[PDB]
Design a protein around this ligand. Structure first.
Ligand SMILES: [Ca+2]
Ligand SMILES: [Ca+2]
Ligand SMILES: [Ca+2]
Ligand SMILES: [Ca+2]
Ligand SMILES: [Ca+2]
Ligand SMILES: [Ca+2]
Ligand SMILES: [Ca+2]
Ligand SMILES: [Ca+2]
Ligand SMILES: [Ca+2]
Ligand SMILES: [Ca+2]
Lengths: 206, 206, 206, 206, 206
C-alpha cells in the first residue's frame, strides 16, 4: 500500500513493454462500478491508445477506457463498445470519470467534471472480479499481449475505482478535489507492480 | 404525486416503446400556457427528436416542442409550426421555457435563460384540456403511434407547466433556481406513468 | 402620458399596417438631438428594417435609424445617409444611442454602450419640429406609405429623445440604467397611439 | 496654454485642409523622445492615415507615426521607416506610446499598454528642434503640402511628448491614467492653432 | 557578478555578430538540469531562431532551445532533438522552463507556467561542464560559427539554470515571481560578456 498522492506514472516513450499492474482485493463480481483518473498525452492527434485496461481470463476487454483516433473516447464493458465523440481535442491534462450499472445498463462518461449524455451498455451483465488491471498498455490477454500502437505515452495518475455508481455530486467533489474513499482501487493506498520503462514523478496537473 | 426534485428520466437507447406519460388534472381549455424543462441529448447532430409532446383526440400536435435536424427548435400549437433557428449547437444540458397566448398569438422561446425574439402563432385558438402528455416519444395519435426516428435519447427533467404566460422575471427565477408553483404540471408533485426502458436517476445538470 | 417603464412594444409578424406613433410636444426646430432605444429582432440576417422613423411634411427621412441588409446601421438626417458598418452581428437585444449637432455636423453612434467613430452629416441643417414619429414601419410620407419589406418584426422599447447632444458620460449612465430626464420623448411619460397588430409586453432585455 | 484634459480634436470628414498645429517651446535638438496619444478612426479597413506628423525644414518625416493600409503601424525617424505589423485590427479607440533613443537606435512601440518587440532605427541621428507638429494631416513640407488620402478622420487626443525615453513602468502609469508631467508637449497645457474643419469635443475613450 | 534583476538583453536587428556569452562556474558534468528564461520576438512567423545555445568542444548542440519555423519549440540534448509543437502562436513575451534528467531521459517543457507533456531524450547521457553558453546566436562551433538566419531579434532575460530538475511547484513559483536560487546560472548574479550590437534595457514583461 503506497500513498501515490500528488504523484503520477510516467511513460516517456512508445513501448511494448512498459506498464503498471494495479492490484484489487476484489471478491464479489461487479454489478456496478466507477473509474476515475487523470492522464496527459499528445497522442490524440496521431493514433489511438489505452487509458485503463481491465482484463479477465475470459475477456480481455472486461472494462476498457480507450481513445480511438479521430473519433473520441471508447468505453467497453464485457467486450461491447460504445463511443463518446470528441471533436476539437485540446492539449492539456484530462480528468475522466466513467461509470456503469448492470441493473439499468446506464453508462456515464464525465470529462473534466462535465457529464456527457447517458448511454446504454451491457444491461444485466456481471463484471468479473479476477482481474488484471493495467495502465500504459492495452491487454489482449489476461496480463499481457500488448500492442505498441496502443500504448500510452505521457502521464497517468489519480486512478480510483468504486464498486458502485458515483452520483453527480460525488463526481463533482472528486473533480474539484474534495475528500473521498474508493473501495476498489485507492490512489492513496495503491498496491501496484511496475514493469519496464515507467517512472514516478510529481503530477503535472493541479 | 411524486416529488421528482433533483431527478430526471433517462432514455438510454433509441426505441419505439419507451416513454413517460404525464397526467394533468386540467379542466378549463387553455387560452395561454408556459412549459419549462431541462433535457440533454447528443442527437442534435444526427437527427430530429421530440422534447415535449402534448396531444388531443383531435390534434396530435396540440403543443409540440421539437428539435428538427440542421434547423433548430420547432414549436407547434394546434398543428401550426414556427421555427427558432439554432446554428452552432453545443453539447450540454439545455433548459427551455416556451409560452403562448391566445389573445395575442405571441409565443416566447427561452433557451438557457435567454429570450429568443417574440413570434406569432395561432391567435385566438384554444388548446384542449383532454390531453395525452408524453416525454420520450412524439405522438401521432392520442397516446401513441410513436416514430423511433423521433424519440429522445438522453435525459429530460424539471418539467413544469402553467396555464398562463410567465413574465421575463418569472422565467429568470425559474432558470436561476428560485421558488415557484406551476398550476398544470409540477415536477415536485408529478403524477406520471412509465412504459418501457425508462429510468429515474439523479439529474446531470445543476 | 403613460409610464412605459419596463415595457416594450411587440410586433409579432411581418406587416404593412402595424405601428406606433410617438407624439412630441415639440416647438423649436431642432439644431441638435439624441435618440436612444432598445430593440430586438432576427431580421438582420434576411432583410433590412426601420428602427426609428421621424418624418416631416417636407422630408420622409428627417431622422432615420435603419438597418440595411449585409451592411449595418444606416443613419439619416434630412435625407442624407451615412453608414455604420457591422460585420458579425449577434442575436441579442441591442441598445443604441445616436446624436447629431447642426453646428458641427458631427454624428455619434453608440451600440450597447460603446461609441462608434464620429462622422459628419448635414452641418448647418435644421430638423423640423412638425414631425410624425413612428416605430415599426418606415415612413415614405408624413405618417404613412409604409413598406412591409422594411417593417420591424420583434420588440422595441426604452425610446427616449433629447433636443441636445448627450455627453459620453451621460450616454453611459443611460446604458447602465442610471437616472435621466429626456426633454423630447420620454419613455416614462410617453404619449403614443397604436395601429394594427402591436402589443405591450414586459421587456425581454434587462 | 489650454488645458485639454478630457477633450479631443475631432476631424469629422475627409479633407485636405483641416488640421491642428501643436507648438513646442523646444530648444535642444532631440537625442531621445517619447510620444503618447489616443486616436479613434474607422479608416484602417479602407486606406492609410497619419497619426502624428513632425516635420523639419530639412525633413518632412522627422518623426512620423502612420497607419499604412493592410500592414499596420509605420514609425519613421529622420525619413527612415520601420513597421509594426498588425493583423486583425479591432474597431475601438487605440492608445499608443512610441519612443526612440539616438544612443542605441532602439525604438519601442506600445499599443493599448502592451509593448511590441524592440526594434532599431537611426542610431546616432539627431532630431531637429525647429519643428512643425501636426495632427490630422500628413506633412510633405514644413507646415503643409497635405495629401487628403492620408488625412485622419475621427478623433485624436491626450497627445504628450517627452525628450527622453519613458520606462515601461512610466508608460504603464500613463496608460492606466496615473499622474505625469511631459516636458515637450503637454495635453494639460497645450499651445495649439486650428485650421479648417476641426472641433473640440469630450473624449470618447475612458 | 552583475545583478540583472528587472533587466533584459536587447538584440534590435538581425545580425551575425551580436551575442552574449554567459559564464558558468561549473565543475561536475551534468546528469540533470533545468533552464528558465523569458524572451520576446516577432520572428516566429517568418523564420527559425535560437533561444538558448549551450555548446561543448565535442558537441555544438549540447543543450539547445530553438524555435523552428512553422513547427514549434525544438529541444536538443547532446545532438538529439525532440519537438514540442505549437500551433496558433501569439505575439507576446514568452516564458519557458525546460528540464532533462539523465537517469530517466525525461524532459519537461513548460510554456508560460503550463507544462507540456513529458517526453524522452538521451537517457543515461552526460552533459559536459566545459561549455560556451550563448544568447542571441546559434552556435555551430564552441563559441562561434553563427548563422544569421538563426539569430534572435528581440529581447531575452531572466535566464537561470540549475543542475537538477525543478519540481512543478518550484517551476510555478519561478513563473509567478516568488524567490529562488539557481546554482548554475543566476540572473541576479550573472557573469557575462557582450559582443556586438547588444543593449541592456528594462524588461518588457512583468
Ligand atoms: Ca484488447
Ligand atoms: Ca490490443
Ligand atoms: Ca405528431
Ligand atoms: Ca411522428
Ligand atoms: Ca423613407
Ligand atoms: Ca420606405
Ligand atoms: Ca511626408
Ligand atoms: Ca504625404
Ligand atoms: Ca548548431
Ligand atoms: Ca547554426
Amino acid at each position: 500500500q503506497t500513498d501515490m498522492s500528488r504523484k503520477a506514472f510516467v511513460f516517456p516513450k512508445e513501448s511494448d513493454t512498459s506498464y503498471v499492474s494495479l492490484k484489487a482485493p476484489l471478491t464479489k463480481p461487479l454489478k456496478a462500478f466507477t473509474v476515475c483518473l487523470h492522464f496527459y498525452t499528445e497522442l490524440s492527434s496521431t493514433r489511438g491508445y489505452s487509458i485503463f485496461s481491465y482484463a479477465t481470463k475470459r475477456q480481455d476487454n472486461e472494462i476498457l477506457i480507450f481513445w480511438s483516433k479521430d473519433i473520441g473516447y471508447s468505453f467497453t464493458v464485457g467486450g461491447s463498445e460504445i463511443l463518446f465523440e470528441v471533436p476539437e481535442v485540446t492539449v492539456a491534462p484530462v480528468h475522466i470519470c466513467t461509470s456503469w450499472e448492470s441493473a439499468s445498463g446506464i453508462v456515464e462518461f464525465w470529462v473534466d467534471g462535465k457529464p456527457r449524455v447517458r448511454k446504454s451498455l451491457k444491461k444485466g451483465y456481471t463484471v468479473g472480479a479476477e482481474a488484471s488491471i493495467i495502465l500504459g498498455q492495452e491487454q489482449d490477454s489476461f496480463g499481457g499481449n500488448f500492442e505498441g500502437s496502443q500504448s500510452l505515452v505521457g502521464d497517468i495518475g489519480n486512478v480510483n475505482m468504486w464498486d458502485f455508481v458515483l452520483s453527480p455530486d460525488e463526481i463533482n467533489t472528486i473533480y474539484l478535489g474534495g475528500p473521498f474513499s474508493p473501495n476498489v482501487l485507492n490512489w492513496r493506498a495503491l498496491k501496484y507492480e511496475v514493469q519496464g520503462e515507467v517512472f514516478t514523478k510529481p503530477q503535472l496537473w493541479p
